[PDB]
Amino acid sequence: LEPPPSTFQPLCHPLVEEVSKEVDGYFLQHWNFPNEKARKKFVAAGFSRVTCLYFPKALDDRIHFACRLLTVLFLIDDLLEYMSFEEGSAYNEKLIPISRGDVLPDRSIPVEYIIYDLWESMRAHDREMADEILEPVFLFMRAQTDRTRARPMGLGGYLEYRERDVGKELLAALMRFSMGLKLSPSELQRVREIDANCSKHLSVVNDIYSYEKELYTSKTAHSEGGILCTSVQILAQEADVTAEAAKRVLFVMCREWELRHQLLVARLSAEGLETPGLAAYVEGLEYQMSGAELWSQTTLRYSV
Amino acid sequence: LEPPPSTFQPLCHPLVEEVSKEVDGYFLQHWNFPNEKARKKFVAAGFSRVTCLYFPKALDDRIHFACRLLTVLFLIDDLLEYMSFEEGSAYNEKLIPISRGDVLPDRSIPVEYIIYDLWESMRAHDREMADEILEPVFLFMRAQTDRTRARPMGLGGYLEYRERDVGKELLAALMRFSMGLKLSPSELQRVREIDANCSKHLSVVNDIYSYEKELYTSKTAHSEGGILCTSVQILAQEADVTAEAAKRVLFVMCREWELRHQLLVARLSAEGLETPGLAAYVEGLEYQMSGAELWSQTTLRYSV
Ligand SMILES: C=C(C)[C@H]1CC[N@@H+]2CCC[C@H](C)[C@@]2(C)C1
Ligand SMILES: C=C(C)[C@H]1CC[N@@H+]2CCC[C@H](C)[C@@]2(C)C1
Ligand SMILES: [Mg+2]
Ligand SMILES: [Mg+2]
Ligand SMILES: [Mg+2]
Ligand SMILES: [Mg+2]
Ligand SMILES: [Mg+2]
Ligand SMILES: [Mg+2]
């Protein structure tokens, strides 16, 4: 697998090591892992490492929050593959009022009190910025079990759906939270087109590196929860080529999106619309794209 | 536009200079051009040159037939852009009985007697092989004004339609005729997968190089006949990139179809299915793909 050249340079949060031990340690203590093999695979994935690659400029005392949220979402993402759409939906919907703090968790159920305590701790640190992550998370959760996954999609329709399933919006809200980066509604409206383009990069890069894993899952897990829903197989079907061929083509498209990102940001600046906050934001998006790819290239989650 | 590497070596018929002079001269005498500018643009296109690139192993006394047929089809292809779907259909349908030789041509109408005299001359040289080109040509002609051109299509649906609009079948039958290459029904059914793959390459390579021409046509010609129907526009729409970015990505896919062509040929031979006739056929298809591309890179039809 040979990735075409990119001009995006990845950055990792300085405290990645100590935060990793902290967050992995917490989940190894509280989360219901089935066995030792699963615990080792969990650590081998490096969910805090990818988070620190996502948000390398996160504040030192907020990066752990982001690591916890993405870690539990990664774990749930895998759980859903053994469920039907119905079971998966019931599972996520139960966590939504708990995430809001409107419903108390069952303390005997790890996922519930982990989710509850997390959001409570985030609201305690920064109430306004924490609340703005909620609905983007709920949007992502509901996309995970959407029956549209089991229906024919073209590349365009897929990317539109996958913007929710890849959690583009929650990642943006979480990035801002972790950086303490407050943006006005008008500012956010200005970078909407940039966000949409960034989403496609995130989605397809992940699709390429995680295809072998998801292929195996589709053959072994639940026929619904583990269904093969990805740009790799969509393009392979549309063009009647192998998945390996589709990856090579999609890789080139990812670099086109990197080029579009730079063009859109350059236009934003030229029109005098790139505020200091917006400048930090679009740079943050670039970190997400390059960080995700670096991790995807090396994580044992995708290679084994 | 820098084309990605291809292992295909394009070949041109040895008699290209003499035949091009002959056929161009024929159409300059008989065809009705609006002005001297159109007459020069016609010669600059090199319609006999691309034919000799399509079928470089055509027999020396048959290549001029192919040159004449593709030339008039190219001319008509352009005429249809200034018509509605209804008018274009009426234009083509009148030429079909004349092509069969069932209806005498109006000698005052160039397109009618050119078509009549051509097909008569082809049946005179090789009746059986000439007749086998008829229905594939009619299939192409009727695709040109198909209402599906005015309906939204995905990449997969488009390529299935374009196989007829790109004249894949007529090119196959014309190639066999020009080479005197006879194949059994068993041999023909055997390579349907190879044909379908080849068709995609012919279509998308053409879409890439002819996009600028067809963009202009969509803005100036008839709202129906000049409508933009191309994989470049479809991929640009679905992936949210420029047409130029779509071209670069589609070109990579074309190289994947080239690889798949070689894979399918090797498999046909790895089994017990590659006859000497089939070997000549699939090699001929490679010439169509590489030849069309070579011409598309230098013809004034697409550059200006
Ligand atoms: C940033 C990405 C490409 C996605 C990688 C996979 N994970 C799964 C758990 C939830 C995350 C938001 C994400 C979908 C992000
Ligand atoms: C071989 C091709 C890529 C097509 C180029 C355009 N011409 C138009 C006139 C009729 C031909 C069959 C073709 C559609 C072939
Ligand atoms: Mg997953
Ligand atoms: Mg998922
Ligand atoms: Mg994936
Ligand atoms: Mg046409
Ligand atoms: Mg045309
Ligand atoms: Mg064209």
Spell out the CATH superfamily of chain A. Answer: Farnesyl Diphosphate Synthase
Largest sheet of chain A: none
Question: Ions, cofactors, ligands: which are bound?
Answer: the ligand C=C(C)[C@H]1CC[N@@H+]2CCC[C@H](C)[C@@]2(C)C1, magnesium ion
Overall morphology of chain A: globular
**Oligomer kind:** homodimer
Distance between the termini of chain A: 15 Å
User: What name does the CATH topology of chain A carry?
Assistant: Farnesyl Diphosphate Synthase
In the CATH hierarchy, what is the architecture of chain A at level 2?
A: Orthogonal Bundle
At the first level of CATH, the class of chain A is Mainly Alpha
Count of DSSP-assigned helices of chain A: 16
Helix percent of chain A reads: over 70%
Task: Provide the β-strand percentage band of chain A.
Answer: under 5%
Number of individual domains of chain A:
1
Please report the two chains with the greatest interface, counting residues with C-beta closer than 8 angstroms to the partner's C-beta.
Answer: A-B, 22 and 23 residues
Cα gyration radius of chain A (Å): 19 Å
The structure class of chain A reads: mainly alpha
Task: Provide an overview of this structure.
Chains A, B: Keywords: Lyase, Magnesium, Metal-binding. Chains A, B: Mg(2+) 2 binds at residue 77. Chains A, B: Mg(2+) 3 binds at residues 206, 210, 214. Chains A, B: Its EC number is 4.2.3.9. The structure is a homodimer of 304-residue chains. Chain A is mainly alpha-helical. Chain A has one domain (1-304): Farnesyl Diphosphate Synthase. Chain A has 16 helices and no strands. Chain A has helices at 16-30, 36-45, 47-54, 63-79, 85-100, 110-125, 127-144, 155-165, 168-179, 185-190, 192-209, 211-220, 231-239, 243-270, 276-298, 300-303. The two termini of chain A are 15 Å apart. The A-B interface holds A 154-156, 159, 196-197, 200, 237-242, 245, 248-249, 252-253, 256-257, 259-260 and B 154-156, 159, 196-197, 200, 235, 237-242, 245, 248-249, 252-253, 256-257, 259-260.
